[PDB]
Design a protein around this ligand. Structure first.
Ligand code: HEM
Ligand code: HEM
Ligand code: HEM
Ligand code: HEM
Lengths: 182, 182, 182, 182
C-alpha cells in the first residue's frame, strides 16, 4: 500500500510557494491556498507549510519522529500533529551596495518541519540548520524524519535530503516521502 | 547613605576583563578573579560579570527591577537574584579577508545584565540589544535598571547609559550606579 | 538593408558563454569557439567576447564610437577594430561562510566592450560600470555605442541596454544591434 | 654623518595626520601644515604626506630607489623626485548595519610612498599593497626603499617595516630611516 518516492522541487523564488500533492505525486497549482484541500505540503526557499492551522483549512499537521533514519521511524502517531502557526517569511531578496535587502510578511508555516527562526531570522530545529559564518551562509541537513498529515488526513513519512540541486543551485529542495502510512 | 555616580570604563580589549569595585569607585587589579573579594562587577566588551556563581566566590548576583528609569526603581528586592553562569566569551577578534575571525572561551558571566546569547552569538534581554543589519552591527540601549549585589552582598542600583565613548569608540562602557541601597 | 533588433540572452551561468550570430539573430551552439566562424559575439555574465584575437579566428573586433546614443553614431569606421586579448574570467562562483568564493581562467575577451578589470576584478570603461558599495554590487549602464565586426567582417552597431531581466535576475543581458552597417 | 633609526607612530585615527621631523626624530605639533617647515613626513592610516606640492611649501618629495633592501640602495638620487598631488583621504570611518561608512576629502599626499588609489580606493605601488579578499582586508608590505627629501631638502632613506603594532592594532606604522644621506 505505502509507496516510497523522492521529489525535487525548485523553491528558489522568494515571492511564491510551490504546492505539492502527496496522492498526485506532483506540484499542483494553487491560487487560494487557505481555501483549497488539493495540496498537502508547500515549499518556499527552506520554509515548509502544511494544509492546516494558519495556512489552511485541511487536516494537516506534523510531528518529529525522534529519528534521523526513515526505517527506524516505524510507529505512526495517531495524534499530536502540530498545526501551522504565523511566522516571518522572506518575500523579497536583493543584493546591492548595502548587502542583501529583504522584505517580509507574516504567514503560516510548519514550525515543526521548518524549524523556529531566531532574532536575526536563522531557522533551526527542523529539516535544515541554517546559519552564517563571518561572511555568508552555512547549511546542515538534520535528516529529521517527520510524520506529516496531508489535507485529507492521510499521513506521509517525510525526510528532506537536499537543499540544492546537482549544480549547487540553492533553494532546490529534495525529499523522500513514504505514503500513505498507517 | 546612598551615593550616585557615573563611571566610564574602556572594555574594548577582547582578551581581558576590567574589574570594578563599588565601594572604591575605581577599577581594581585582579589576577585571580575566582578567588578575590575585592571586585564587584567586571566588564568585557558588552559582557558583564559578577562576583558569584561561575565567576567568583563572592555574594554577588543580579535582578532586573522591571523598570527603565533609576528614579522609578525604589524598592530594593530581597529575592530573585541570579548568579553567574557559563557562557561564550569572545577572547580574540581580527578582521581579515574572510571577515571577522573570532576565538571563544566558556567563562562565567551575568546573563541577567549581559543578556542571553543566541546561536550566532547575539545577546539580548540585558543592558544592550546587540544585533546586525545585512552587513554590520546595530545597537540599542535597553535602559534596564538592575539591582546588583557586590562581593560582600551590599547592593548597587545600576543602569548602563552608553556602549561607546564621545568619539564613538565601541566597547567603552558607561553606567550609573547608586550604592549602597536599602 | 540594415535592420535594428533588440536581443536578450541569459548569460547568468559562470561556467560557460552564450554565443550569438548577428546574421541569424539567434544564439548558436559552439563547441570549438577558437575554430568556428558561425558566431559573432559571446556573453558570459558581463563579459563580451568577439571572434578575433585571443578568442577566435574570425575577422571580429570592436571600436567605441564616442557616442551614447545610437542615432548619433553615423560614421562607420573602416579600421581600428580592436581584437580580443587575454583577461581574467570568473568561471565558478559560490557564496559560503567566507563570502563569495570564485575560480578564474585567463581567456580571450573584448576589452573595448567589456571594459578593463582592475586589481580587485571590477570592470569599467565598456558597456557596464560595475563596482561595490561597502557590502555589495552597484551597476551603471554606460550606454556606450560600439561598432562591432562579426566573424565575416560585416559590422553591427551595438548598444547594451540592460544587465538584468524584468524580475531583476542578474546576468541576463539585453542589447540593441543594427546590422549590417556601412 | 647619517644615523639610522626605527620609528613607530600610531596613525590609526581617520580624522587627523601625525607629523614627523627627521632632524628632531620626534612627532611634532602642526596646526597649519601647508605653511610650516617644521615637519618632513606625515602619516594618516596608510597614507603618507611630504612637505611639498599640494601638501606644503617645503622642498620635499620622494623617489622609489628600485630596491627593497636598505643596504642595497647606496646611491642617493639627485633626480626623479615627485611632489605631493591631490588624492582621496578617508577622514571618517564607522561600521554599522550597512558595512563601513566612510567620508572623504581631497587632500595632498605622496603618491610615490602611499601608492596610487584605484576606483574602489585600494592603494598599491607604494609601501603597502592593501586589498580585500571576499570579506575583508589583506596586507602586504612591499619593502620598497624610498629616498625622501624633507622640508629643507635634506634627504632620508626610508623603508616601512610594519602597518600594525605588536598587539595587531592596525594603522600603527613603523619605518626605518637613515638621515641625512649624501
Ligand atoms: C558578508 C556579508 C553577508 C553575505 C555575503 C551573506 C550572504 C547570504 C546569502 C548568499 C544568503 C542566501 C542563502 C540561501 O538562502 O541559501 C543569505 C541569507 C541570509 N542571511 Fe546573509 N549574508 C551576509 C550577512 C548577513 C548578516 C550580518 C546577517 C544577520 C546577522 C545575515 C542573515 C541572513 C539570513 C537570516 C538569511 C536567510 C534569509 C531568508 O531567506 O529568510 N546575513 N545571506
Ligand atoms: C558584512 C559583514 C559583517 C560585518 C562588516 C560585521 C561587522 C562587525 C563589527 C564591526 C563588529 C564589532 C561590533 C562591536 O563589538 O561593537 C561585529 C561583531 C559581531 N558580529 Fe559581525 N559583521 C559581519 C557579519 C557577521 C555575520 C554574518 C554574523 C553572524 C553569523 C556576525 C556576528 C557578529 C557577532 C555575534 C558579533 C559580536 C562578537 C562579540 O563581541 O562577541 N557578523 N561584526
Ligand atoms: C558584504 C560583502 C560582499 C557582498 C554581499 C558581495 C556581493 C556580491 C554579489 C551579489 C555579486 C554578484 C554581482 C553580479 O554579478 O551581478 C558580487 C560580485 C563581485 N564581487 Fe562582491 N560582495 C562582497 C564583498 C566583496 C569584496 C570585499 C570585493 C573585493 C574588494 C568584491 C568583489 C567582487 C567582484 C570583483 C565581483 C564580480 C565577480 C565576477 O563576476 O567577476 N566583493 N559580489
Ligand atoms: C564583508 C565586507 C567587508 C568587510 C568586513 C570589510 C572590512 C574592512 C576593514 C576591517 C577595513 C579597515 C582595514 C585597515 O584600515 O587596516 C576596511 C577598509 C577598507 N575597505 Fe572594506 N570591508 C568589506 C567590504 C568592502 C568592499 C566591498 C569594498 C570595496 C568597494 C571595501 C573597500 C575598502 C577600502 C577601500 C578600505 C580602506 C579605507 C581607507 O582607509 O581608505 N570594503 N574594510
Amino acid at each position: 500500500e505505502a509507496v516510497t518516492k523522492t521529489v525535487t522541487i525548485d523553491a528558489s523564488k522568494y515571492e511564491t510557494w510551490q504546492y505539492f500533492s502527496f496522492s498526485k505525486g506532483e506540484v499542483v497549482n494553487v491560487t487560494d491556498y487557505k481555501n483549497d484541500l488539493n495540496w498537502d505540503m508547500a515549499l518556499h526557499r527552506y520554509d515548509v507549510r502544511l494544509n492546516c492551522g494558519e495556512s489552511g483549512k485541511g487536516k494537516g499537521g506534523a510531528v518529529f519522529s525522534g529519528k534521523t533514519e526513515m526505517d527506524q521511524a516505524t510507529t505512526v502517531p495517531t495524534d499530536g500533529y502540530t498545526v501551522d502557526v504565523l511566522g516571518r517569511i522572506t518575500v523579497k531578496y536583493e543584493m546591492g551596495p548595502d548587502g542583501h535587502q529583504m522584505e517580509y510578511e507574516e504567514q503560516g508555516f510548519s514550525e515543526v518541519i521548518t524549524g523556529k527562526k531566531n532574532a536575526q531570522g536563522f531557522a533551526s530545529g527542523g529539516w535544515l540548520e541554517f546559519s552564517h559564518g563571518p561572511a555568508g551562509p552555512t547549511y546542515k541537513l538534520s535528516k529529521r524524519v517527520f510524520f506529516v498529515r496531508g489535507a485529507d488526513g492521510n499521513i506521509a513519512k517525510v525526510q528532506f535530503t537536499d537543499y540544492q540541486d546537482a549544480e549547487l543551485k540553492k533553494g532546490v529542495i529534495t525529499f523522500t516521502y513514504t505514503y500513505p502510512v498507517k
